[PDB]
Design a protein around this ligand. Structure first.
Ligand SMILES: NC(=O)c1ccc[n+]([C@@H]2O[C@H](COP(=O)([O-])OP(=O)(O)OC[C@H]3O[C@@H](n4cnc5c(N)ncnc54)[C@H](O)[C@@H]3O)[C@@H](O)[C@H]2O)c1
Ligand SMILES: NC(=O)c1ccc[n+]([C@@H]2O[C@H](COP(=O)([O-])OP(=O)(O)OC[C@H]3O[C@@H](n4cnc5c(N)ncnc54)[C@H](O)[C@@H]3O)[C@@H](O)[C@H]2O)c1
Ligand SMILES: NC(=O)c1ccc[n+]([C@@H]2O[C@H](COP(=O)([O-])OP(=O)(O)OC[C@H]3O[C@@H](n4cnc5c(N)ncnc54)[C@H](O)[C@@H]3O)[C@@H](O)[C@H]2O)c1
Ligand SMILES: NC(=O)c1ccc[n+]([C@@H]2O[C@H](COP(=O)([O-])OP(=O)(O)OC[C@H]3O[C@@H](n4cnc5c(N)ncnc54)[C@H](O)[C@@H]3O)[C@@H](O)[C@H]2O)c1
Ligand SMILES: NC(=O)c1ccc[n+]([C@@H]2O[C@H](COP(=O)([O-])OP(=O)(O)OC[C@H]3O[C@@H](n4cnc5c(N)ncnc54)[C@H](O)[C@@H]3O)[C@@H](O)[C@H]2O)c1
Ligand SMILES: NC(=O)c1ccc[n+]([C@@H]2O[C@H](COP(=O)([O-])OP(=O)(O)OC[C@H]3O[C@@H](n4cnc5c(N)ncnc54)[C@H](O)[C@@H]3O)[C@@H](O)[C@H]2O)c1
Lengths: 258, 258, 258, 259, 259, 258
């Protein structure tokens, strides 16, 4: 069946709403989890290790690589879950706001995957199914939205980078699977901020009309819970997903398909 | 834990290449499996029941509903895996060949889902995550191909029917998730026949050049194995996929994404 | 530039809301237009010929082929614009309602293209850019919707048949381009009926709430006008579109992309 | 001609390139007034009413384009972001600065240029019921990934999504500005030439002849596109005939993305 | 489809000669990739994608052809053995070494060349359902004897029979390689010119005008052929349209052999 | 290339296995095709005209001449493809069976060529390469066979008549090329009947042993397909064959040469 026995996993943004549930779900499937986030310390349920880690910092990633190299000699699963959102009027958005969103959401994947590539190649030799890189995109990487230009653009970049790396790592014989995950509206502080900033921009009349509109756009009729992201990430990280690479893995309550 | 504890599952085309692996995988996750196919009897490893079942027959589906109703009182998971393929020159394809492919690949889902809907509504009350309907489409439902007009058209119909039923069942409050599965080239008798018929048509120079070309179109660089379909179907049927409806679930080695 | 000089065009459903505007637009670009519909006679502005034509009838299509063969010796452009819609509850929809929608929307393209294929091959020799087959799909062929299972399934079939025929006709050297057109909500009797039947079904509270909801789902903020379909069809039929085949040509005010 | 650009003031970037020259010819043939821009200090661009030296990465360069359009016409009806670059690289040997260089030319060009020309595009939006038209050059590479094209493909997917967001935002704010992405397949230009050669040097393809034949066969139509085959599509998107077309992926790829 | 050589990698020997130049033009016009070879260190062969210096009697020369085809394309779809010589002699004054010289160019060329290119032709056999195509230049002289042409006629009959044997053998071994012989009549080239002049010097003919008229009258069509009239036949044999043609005598002789 | 631009072509036995493929191939090379056979009507793809035509009837040939004269003023290509076979014991074959085979296979060419000669002379003026007469002989016109005395004798007569007419038309300055075509075993109803009658005669043990024996006599190792006759006939009819007259054009998979 679907398990992560003898899987050494790195999860970024691990102290966030989705991140904490990914760590719990992956531990429950018997993974060894290195959890990382911006805080100098955190109590992340299911983590075997916590590291302070700015995903924009090559030095931060080298510290993750050093701990994994010393303690395990490989990385089997890399979950790029760290990200930010802004809600802005395009004409009032300086180029530096696009660049800040790009640095956290996309450069994180480029720097992190380059630094951990030797360790992922070892993951590729440890399991016939391959090492697994899971990149957090969004339904915002599939469908546009007014006032989300910077966020949506970065999440479409994440999606396409996933396809290119899946194809490249397979062509070079590294046995590393790369997939993008596309959550719908998930009940976390990030969705909260986006909704509030939508109201202050005057995109929505009130926070109640905004919430009801967003809920109704999902065919399933509600926001997702962070725990509903866990199974999908466990599946992609497992040998059960040995024929899954370059894929858009959608967990959006039907949002993108209507 | 991605599991199918207390899940009553119906799997059609269960004696086929993928079907046998679906039954094994679902039993291994603790499902009760009603396996069905065209043969009057079959030894399907992991099946609790086997029924002779032509998926084009309303009477055949009523016999499946009667056994499930009598023995369990619900259906938690319905896997529409039965399907056929033809390879033909469009101009030499009579309308009756399109209709034959449509009857097995699409009408099966319409008739079967209508007949089992009362039992799926009971599945919807038995699990918070919902009853799960899994429709076998294809990468051929996403991307066209010369000489596969009848097959590809039917698999695109399967894909869109999945989106419509997911949205409709959610709007009516039935708590039934509906998803389409899109396998790439999977090593089964069906792929074998398609490749041989492609050679006889003169679409491919030889069966060796056809095989190498098809393998190279997959970024992962090979055909899939039937067992590689099992985990994905178990995930979609489980409560772990409670936020997954109307979705294209792709298991294609990256075929569709390059 | 974009023109249809010396283009012999067949347009089905030519007496409908979009059809009449397609005939006007194509005449204005200097096409010779054979207009066809169900009525025994019609005054279709811009038509050089009108034929009574049931697109579900092989005999009806042979009569179109005979007139084109006798008067011009080729067909340069074939616009499959004839189509119907129903709005229904899936569980109350007999298989015969799916079949009726399939026969008009899909079998029309299969029968018509097979019957006109010799004449389209002559179109393929008359213009370097190729003969052009334009199939009317829908945003309903791209995105699912509650209560539109029969319609959406048929329009996804139209879309995929277009991809397969584009690829097949190119592989066989016929120089015939095939593309699908995907209108959003266009202000015609068909959209009118769908909205009214949605009210009678109880899918929408009132015809005013339905209209406002459908308008708001389009980023552009309104229904399309039938005339807004004309330029796109003229483009696809012209030599300006010589590198366009197998394509989804979307005219939906942004509907599918948010 | 019934699809036309009468009284359309058009800005076309990368106008001296393979596709750009054909866009200018096609748009002039549909009666547009064309401001052509590229990196060269001077160029003879057939159909251009004006040529400006213009680095699309420069806010100051864009302000000079805005000043000429403002002074001579008082509006911009059509903005074609056609300037772009490609690189072909091994991901693990690609410094972050190479991703940033590709992003700056292919994406920041659209952000800076559209911000600077927004007042003039708003005037375009008042001049035609159909709206001002912004046409962003993405790629089939913005729809489908490819080994060794990580930096290029990522930038072209960003272009595609930015197009959808701006189409939706400009409509929500009532500016009457249509925004669409164009997705060419393999078009016979120096850019496709360089990509194929660099693919050989990287050892992605055995020879330049096997690479060319493989790329041609991936297109159902069975050949590369010619630059002229991009012209009609861009004319259509810029015209009032496309008044119901915004946020759209406009594909001119010989069927590449659909098989 | 029709008769075409799309994605056909073709080797043509004696490509700088009268017939050879027309074969290269005709095969390029049908969209073949043509590797042209002849004795000159360089030549301007219209329609050739590559020219190689190549003595068809040299195993090393053939290995250089195989290396270029292997490196650039990975297969050979069509091999046209067009290189040949003629002599006109009195049998009793013809040393064994003159027979051997004609045999080496006209026959050993086909044996050495086909053996060296066989791995590449097997790949041609996998690339097309119709098969790789080997086209051997025989002659009406390989069908009908003639006074004073003993060395030439003997070599051209050997070419004809080798073609039948290789067609049958390659089919029995499952290689999917078609082999056919081509039998031109009198074609207006330097070779026909020399044969006629040497016939006069030998005292076979009174004058070059009486020789020409006699040879023309032997052809029912009433004239010599033009080199361009060989092109279509070779294109046909090299194409998938000839998928049921192997071991065959393909005659282009104005009726010479049939009266 | 090799093409039939502005070529007016008459093809007899055009509704048969090879004949239908000849018409398709010749239309694909841009010929104007007058297709003829014994049925009062037929749908022959690529035919510009169909005529009911018994090739043994001078009156039937005059009707072909009248249509060509009225509509085009010339014939550029004449394909004598109509023929029959019998399989018999010589000693049980009455003289009238030899005469019936001679009338269809040989007298057809004599009558047809005499009646169309004025129109063929005009074709000789219309193209430098000449009018082209293509006579269907057989490998049976080159090599004898037990039980095929009547058929083989007629096909050798066809072959020699071709040589004589090629030489005579050139001597008289008409610019009309005449060639014989020699198919091997081609997969058509005619080969089917010959094989079955070979079994009934007791020439072969079974229809499977007969088929395998006949296939093995062809060096290429199989029967030909009717489509494999097309390119050869197009070549002979084209200006590319301007130096080809009196010739045996063999399409026999090597049958005659081992
Ligand atoms: N919540 C949703 O509706 C939703 C929808 C689509 C996609 N996503 C994606 O899911 C992922 C997780 O989002 P979430 O809802 O859990 O949000 P969250 O903000 O709750 O968690 C994100 C975490 O990322 C961390 N982080 C931010 N910048 C960092 C940096 N430079 N270095 C290291 N860590 C950094 C934050 O500290 C935070 O703990 C993100 O990539 C987000 O874009 C979420
Ligand atoms: N194998 C591939 O490469 C591939 C690719 C994409 C899609 N698929 C789909 O996956 C599913 C399983 O395919 P597979 O590869 O195992 O093929 P398979 O032929 O091995 O199995 C299909 C089964 O369907 C059964 N079946 C056919 N018609 C039926 C009918 N009328 N009633 C009941 N049963 C019927 C057959 O008996 C067979 O057991 C199919 O829907 C197929 O189209 C497979
Ligand atoms: N109007 C929209 O909102 C919308 C949206 C998506 C796509 N479309 C598609 O665009 C096309 C044009 O639709 P419209 O809006 O003009 O609808 P319409 O009903 O105004 O026109 C459709 C025409 O089809 C004809 N028709 C129906 N069945 C026929 C048959 N069997 N044989 C021949 N003619 C037949 C009708 O007589 C009518 O003239 C259709 O294919 C439709 O599905 C329209
Ligand atoms: N040719 C293809 O196959 C292909 C495929 C898909 C997409 N595209 C896209 O189409 C567009 C046209 O490309 P092309 O094929 O004509 O290539 P090209 O290189 O011939 O033209 C691109 C032009 O952009 C200009 N340019 C580059 N950087 C610039 C800068 N900083 N400031 C101003 N001008 C700058 C160059 O000077 C050049 O003239 C590009 O966006 C390209 O990415 C091309
Ligand atoms: N011209 C005729 O009447 C006639 C008749 C029947 C057969 N053919 C045959 O057609 C073919 C072409 O003849 P053509 O008339 O064009 O003659 P040609 O002399 O014009 O050309 C023959 C070519 O072969 C080349 N060649 C000779 N020895 C060679 C060697 N050792 N290695 C490589 N190249 C070598 C010559 O340099 C020349 O370019 C020959 O095989 C000839 O025998 C010609
Ligand atoms: N098929 C083989 O194996 C083979 C081998 C050698 C040569 N051939 C020759 O090829 C040609 C085509 O044969 P096929 O295999 O297509 O057979 P076929 O029987 O399918 O076609 C022959 C056609 O000739 C027509 N015909 C017969 N008598 C006629 C008459 N009196 N007037 C007009 N039409 C008449 C028939 O109606 C038929 O349509 C014939 O000349 C045949 O002898 C066939």
């Amino acid at each position: 069946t679907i398990a992560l026995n003898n899987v050494v996993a790195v999860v970024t943004g691990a102290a966030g709403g989705i991140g904490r549930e990914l760590v719990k779900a992956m531990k429950a499937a018997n993974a060894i989890v290195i959890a990382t986030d911006m805080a100098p310390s955190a109590d992340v349920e299911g983590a075997d290790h916590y590291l302070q880690h700015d995903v924009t910092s090559e030095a931060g990633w080298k510290a993750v690589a050093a701990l994994a190299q010393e303690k395990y000699g490989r990385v089997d699963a890399l979950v790029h879950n760290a990200g930010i959102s802004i809600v802005t009027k395009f004409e009032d958005t300086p180029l530096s706001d696009f660049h800040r969103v790009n640095t956290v959401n996309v450069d994180s994947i480029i720097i992190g995957t380059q630094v951990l590539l030797p360790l992922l190649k070892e993951g590729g030799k440890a399991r016939a199914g391959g090492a697994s890189v899971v990149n957090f995109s969004s339904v915002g990487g599939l469908r546009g939205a007014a006032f989300l230009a910077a966020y949506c653009t970065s999440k479409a970049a994440v999606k396409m980078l996933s396809k290119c790396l899946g194809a490249e790592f397979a062509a070079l014989g590294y046995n590393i699977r790369v997939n993008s995950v596309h959550p719908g509206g998930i009940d976390t502080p990030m969705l909260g901020s986006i909704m509030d900033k939508a109201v202050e921009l005057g995109a929505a009349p009130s926070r109640e009309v905004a919430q009801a509109a967003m809920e109704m756009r999902h065919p399933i009729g509600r926001m997702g819970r962070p725990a509903e992201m866990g199974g999908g990430v466990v599946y992609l990280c497992s040998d059960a997903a040995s024929f899954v690479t370059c894929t858009e893995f959608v967990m959006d309550g039907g949002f993108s398909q209507v």
